[PDB]
């Protein structure tokens, strides 16, 4: 890896949108992945860093970057609710049907998690509800066995 | 008193042969040690989860075990933490002066009854419960140099040829094994195991039924059939001995007739129980014993019957099997003890030569040299009495209290010969006047003396413990020189002494000493007729002592603080830390780099490099290990450049080069147990249930907060690891049923495969060892490996695991730490230079007010007791001043006149810190307790004088001038004396440079500097502080 | 008598019959107490807010309360005037035969899926020279 | 219900009791007010 | 239960008496390996000490020997109690 | 003195392939030979 | 046994100094005590 | 300490009678003592 790549890793983690705002000037790389295969972008999406993800969209940033799981970005802010992230990815053409290597999209975790906002945003977007993961569950399908009566309405 | 032992000169010499015998005999009998008991008594729960994270620990263990620590007496507070390798480890610390045996007995006790509360696995592997101490008396390397031994096969070794006679070596406290012995390892395989349609559930079932002791009975036992003549015991089964009886193990037979081993779907061989940690020394494979002193055991004479035990083993050890030392205290004690009787001897010495310079008789020499020496035994028999042990801190105790020894005989001594040249008095109606001058000023003195270290004892805490040392060890010395300056002295002046004429001063005598005397009383006319100069304008030496007073708490402030100085132990520490999720091979790499560095750079001055891989500090983990650097000996490192501060501070700078791993190198304090002064130790606790998350955020917000003010706090960092990201396996319930797989079917097959499991013991050689089931390397690094293990179902068909499991990333804790009971984060940090200790905790609690709503704090270790022992500290200055002033008030009737004397303390001091501030050293314990010598030497000084000023003006009627310059001509000759013995006493500590030279310099410049203006000064300002007193009232 | 050595002289002969207790009663906790048969005092804790019920104001004291009280020296024992919070699982003898389930099914089900699972580790000791993967497994956890 | 330990001091442990309290007091949800409706140690204090 | 001197001792006996190391005022330890299973190892202190606190001593450094014991003998409980050799009187009960 | 043993080998490939459980062998071997403690019972008011 | 007899002669030799020692410092003399403690020898004699 | 003038009596069962049995002569003995307020009085068990 690189000595800068490292850093905007770190950087974009713990939320730091001073030290990232430099990395950017100074060319950090934006595609720089960990071990599991997290970019800069999947870590601001899981940890709920907003304008680290707006930054990071603008300095060409991969919106469907993958980890070795699958997963994208737009599963990591969909699953811990993080509306203004979902839309800020959707809105820069993140995949709304992407799927994991256990065929779940972000619509899956979301309902899971009881995400109302976030499942709205998605539909809104396209998203798929007859989708199945490895299991052929739907969306739909996890809400009716979690309880969730208002979920299972827009479903 | 002395009147008493004048005439019965027998007497005094049966008390001094006592004193002599039981000092002798304590000598021998007394425990000898680096350091004594400081910290507080801790007692740490070690428990073990197998293949288990940190929140599986957490939650079903610490907070099981945390949960039943109720009911237990003295205790102060309750410091956790569960780790990813499956290991917590619960501290509990108790008051100061608890009863230790009592409070790690109430700890086991409460453990017993929650026992059966823990899971399975824990109870099997079982809770052990120690005593918290890092004092280590010798750490014994078993390294092998031919190749032919695994750090496996040494540590089986170790653990059964050598740890037993170890720890039944006299004076053995403690011996902790650094590896595991052997364990029947069956590496399983999933290829084979899916072919014969088995599983590892299987693998455990035949295991535990094969290998296992079964109860049989008898043979013609009772109630018998009578008429039996055989009684004979009957043995079933037996645990198993060897690899190819485990092989051997049947777990199936096909319906063709082959039989299913356990050696055709497994690996079986004898490995090591826990392969966590990879340890080298120079390279090549070692393990360790961690050894530890007993309570009231020589340390000296343990280390030395521990190398006779290792000597007797050495023609049976293997091939290329080699005893190495990495760690040892003794030569440190040997050095600490030698140098401190060189000293005493030294002192001796030097007090004949200055006795016998200004004396100039042999008769009188002799009586220092019998009195102080008895001083010193009686001493011994006193710290033997008070449960003392012979430390660094009681033998440099005596050190720092030769000054008053000596200075009691030499005050006799003179105070004869100058009564017997004033008047012509034979020795023996000489001494009785002689000694009616100085016995209520010598009784007064022990009084003065005592009202300064007697209150320093009261400290708590550490810091308490450590001053009890000097505080005893001098009290006790004082008590016992002023009992035989009363007792032994004044016999010994009566019937030793030589009769001196009147008037002969010795200027009538030829040659050097003819010179001498001729010189010295020039001199002493000169010092009254300057004394006398000064009593003229005594308003001029008033504002030029307030100068002293301002520049002396001026340099008080300009000292850095410190608790003990950080000496060249020999050896030192190296941090290797790399990032989060690198493995025990990257680590490796890197260790391989730092051991060639101090073999190729520094291989003038390292001896070995003990790299452990895996280390216990920073959560154990594979990215993290140690690099123990053990130098040469002191005499072959020679200068400032080759000592442990310049190869630490040179390895730093090298090591920062290395890219992807944070090492650096840092040497061990003096005591373990105290960490650092001007330090603290936070804690962010968690007080309303928020969360890992939210907790985790409200650090970085206190961490952040901490950075904005450089100018009050410096190096804030937090001590524990970040998340790490960890691979969530999710079994549907609903497919799992629908195939029919049981779930405990599933997590047995996960759990033994990819984290291990213990299924039972088994006999090697006459030894109970374990026996664990794990996959083999090759089917568990992937999360591609997961969909490889096939489990059976109801019907049997065998479903791989990824038909039931869905997995996905995320981010969780390697390392939960807990504070008292609930969820917390300690940081650690100093305070910046120019702020004290107590500006750096109160802006920390000021920025802990502003973190969100449910995060709480609270001080640990060295912050909770620094708390406690600042409340204690101005009254027992406040009692010292005033026991002080009133032991004097009481000696000369008087409640102005002791002013005089208490004046003399900055004249002391000032000294004390030029010495300290021109050569680079701290306010350190030695530092302290050494301005407490010279501010009582030079007291007593003062007193003499004072005394002798006031009983001339009331019981010859002399004028206030003409006494005190008659007082201080009288005290000029044993004033110089004294000093001159004790500041060439105590030159060879300022100059140590070599071994242990961190304590002597620390305790030799302190003093030294200090005894320079103590007596420079206080010749010229006593008669000052006399006269401007007595004017004043 | 020392009240120290006369409770770990009755907890050695307990220690004896332990195992001889049924099960239940182990689990449930044994406890060995040298406390005086009178109450020093008793720490009232009420809601002047309304917000909390009797139920709620006694979890809260036994959970975040009740616990530092036991563990702080000359506390020989706390009584708690309530009862900490437990997961009520309250059994339909209907709907359990309507499905042919019993309390021996509800038990297991809660047992298998209630558990923190010891998955292992990814790359984990002793690994394959190559391995740059370290990572905790995360298997079912204590539902909450 | 707090139970005195054998041999300890009643206003020792009283005293330790109440600054245990007074930690938790600032982390206590909305209503939550401890109360003394039973404690023999203030009349040891006032008596003395 | 059941297990004879051999294996009591290889897997009870040495166990702990490895763990009875830097015992204080302790002058020998004499221990008995049973073909039936009983393990009994006295600890003699020295005259004057405190046989309280050496009981205490002893129970917590069996603590450390305890989990490498096995499951079985765990099952029976390991008692700790002060000893003595001599009987002071013995009873006798008839039915006359 | 050293005293003679029964020593008793069961054969598990024996015991296997005829169906007989080594748990069901151990316990009939060891309760007939040995004598096994069940469980308790109350004797006149007390637990034996 | 062992131990009382090692012990033996180190007990008789510190109660003779002691003894002596005693002497000295109450008759103030060297030659009091030395003269008393020949008289040990006497006694033993009979004793044995 | 006590109460003064209160006593502490236990009625112990010293032949595995039961409890049934304990239960007759408990009844039997405050039955008794009821018969002699002149000096028992308040005579009561302290069980259920
Ligand atoms: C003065 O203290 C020092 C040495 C004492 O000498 C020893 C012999 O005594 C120790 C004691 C009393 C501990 O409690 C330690 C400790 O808690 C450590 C680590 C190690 O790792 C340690 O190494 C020790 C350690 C020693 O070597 N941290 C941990 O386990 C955890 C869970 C996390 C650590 C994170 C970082 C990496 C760490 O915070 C770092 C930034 C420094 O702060 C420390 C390494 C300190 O270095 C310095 C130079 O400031 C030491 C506490
Ligand atoms: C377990 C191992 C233990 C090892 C240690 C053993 C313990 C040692 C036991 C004590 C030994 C003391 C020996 C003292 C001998 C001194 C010389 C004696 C000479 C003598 O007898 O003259 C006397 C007085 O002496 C005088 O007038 C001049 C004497 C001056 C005082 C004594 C000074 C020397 C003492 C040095 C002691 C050093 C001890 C070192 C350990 C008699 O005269 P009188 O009184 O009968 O007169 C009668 C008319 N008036
Ligand atoms: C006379 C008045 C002044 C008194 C000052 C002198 C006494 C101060 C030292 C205290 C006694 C030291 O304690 C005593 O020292 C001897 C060495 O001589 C030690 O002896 C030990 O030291 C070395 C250590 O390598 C070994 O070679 C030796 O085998 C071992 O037994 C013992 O640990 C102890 O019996
Ligand atoms: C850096 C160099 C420093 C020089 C040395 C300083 C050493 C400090 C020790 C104190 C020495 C004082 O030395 C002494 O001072 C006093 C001043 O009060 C002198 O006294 C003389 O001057 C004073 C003031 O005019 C007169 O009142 C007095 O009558 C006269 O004799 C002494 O003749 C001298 O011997
Ligand atoms: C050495 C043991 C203690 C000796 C005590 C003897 C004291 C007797 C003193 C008698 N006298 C005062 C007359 O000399
Ligand atoms: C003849 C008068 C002599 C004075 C004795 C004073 C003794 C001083 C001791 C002070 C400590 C309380
Ligand atoms: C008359 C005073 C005698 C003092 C004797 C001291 C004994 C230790
Ligand atoms: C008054 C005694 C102080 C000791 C040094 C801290």
Known sequence: ?155 | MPNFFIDRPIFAWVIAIIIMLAGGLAILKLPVAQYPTIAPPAVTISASYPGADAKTVQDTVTQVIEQNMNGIDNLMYMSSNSDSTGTVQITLTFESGTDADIAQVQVQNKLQLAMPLLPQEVQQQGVSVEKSSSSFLMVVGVINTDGTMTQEDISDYVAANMKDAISRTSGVGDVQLFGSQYAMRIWMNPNELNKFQLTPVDVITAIKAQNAQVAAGQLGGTPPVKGQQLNASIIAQTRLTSTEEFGKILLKVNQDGSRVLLRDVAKIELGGENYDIIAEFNGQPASGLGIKLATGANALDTAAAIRAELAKMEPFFPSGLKIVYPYDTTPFVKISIHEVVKTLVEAIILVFLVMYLFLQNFRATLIPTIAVPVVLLGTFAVLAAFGFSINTLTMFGMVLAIGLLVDDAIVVVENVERVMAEEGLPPKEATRKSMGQIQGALVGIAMVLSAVFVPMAFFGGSTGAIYRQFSITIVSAMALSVLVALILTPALCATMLKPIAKGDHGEGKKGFFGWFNRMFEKSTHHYTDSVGGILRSTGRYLVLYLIIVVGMAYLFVRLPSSFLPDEDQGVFMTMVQLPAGATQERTQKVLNEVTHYYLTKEKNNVESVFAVNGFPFAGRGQNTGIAFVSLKDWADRPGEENKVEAITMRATRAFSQIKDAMVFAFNLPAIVELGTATGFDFELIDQAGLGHEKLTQARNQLLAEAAKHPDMLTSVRPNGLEDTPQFKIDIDQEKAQALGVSINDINTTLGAAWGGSYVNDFIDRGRVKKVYVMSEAKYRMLPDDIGDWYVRAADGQMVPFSAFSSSRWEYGSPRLERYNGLPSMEILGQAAPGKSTGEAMELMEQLASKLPTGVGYDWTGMSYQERLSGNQAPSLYAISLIVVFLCLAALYESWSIPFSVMLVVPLGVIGALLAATFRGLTNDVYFQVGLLTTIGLSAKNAILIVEFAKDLMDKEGKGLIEATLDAVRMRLRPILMTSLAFILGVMPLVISTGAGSGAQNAVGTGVMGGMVTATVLAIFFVPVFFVVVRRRF
């Not at chain 1, 709205?120 to 979690?146: C, H, M, P, R, W």
């Open chain 1, 1 to 155: 890896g690189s000595d800068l790549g490292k850093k905007l890793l770190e950087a974009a983690r713990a939320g730091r949108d001073d030290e990232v705002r430099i990395l950017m000037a100074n060319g950090a790389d934006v595609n720089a992945a960990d071990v599991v295969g997290w970019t800069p972008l999947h870590l601001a999406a899981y940890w709920g860093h907003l304008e680290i993800v707006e930054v990071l969209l603008k300095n060409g940033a991969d919106v469907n970057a993958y980890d070795t799981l699958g997963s994208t970005p737009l599963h990591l802010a969909a699953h811990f609710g993080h509306l203004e992230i979902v839309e800020v990815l959707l809105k820069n053409g993140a995949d709304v049907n992407a799927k994991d290597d256990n065929g779940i999209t972000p619509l899956h975790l979301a309902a899971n998690r009881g995400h109302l906002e976030i499942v709205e945003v998605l539909l809104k977007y396209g998203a798929d509800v007859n989708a199945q993961d490895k299991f052929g569950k739907t969306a739909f399908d996890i809400s009716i066995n979690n309880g969730n009566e208002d979920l299972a309405e827009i479903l």
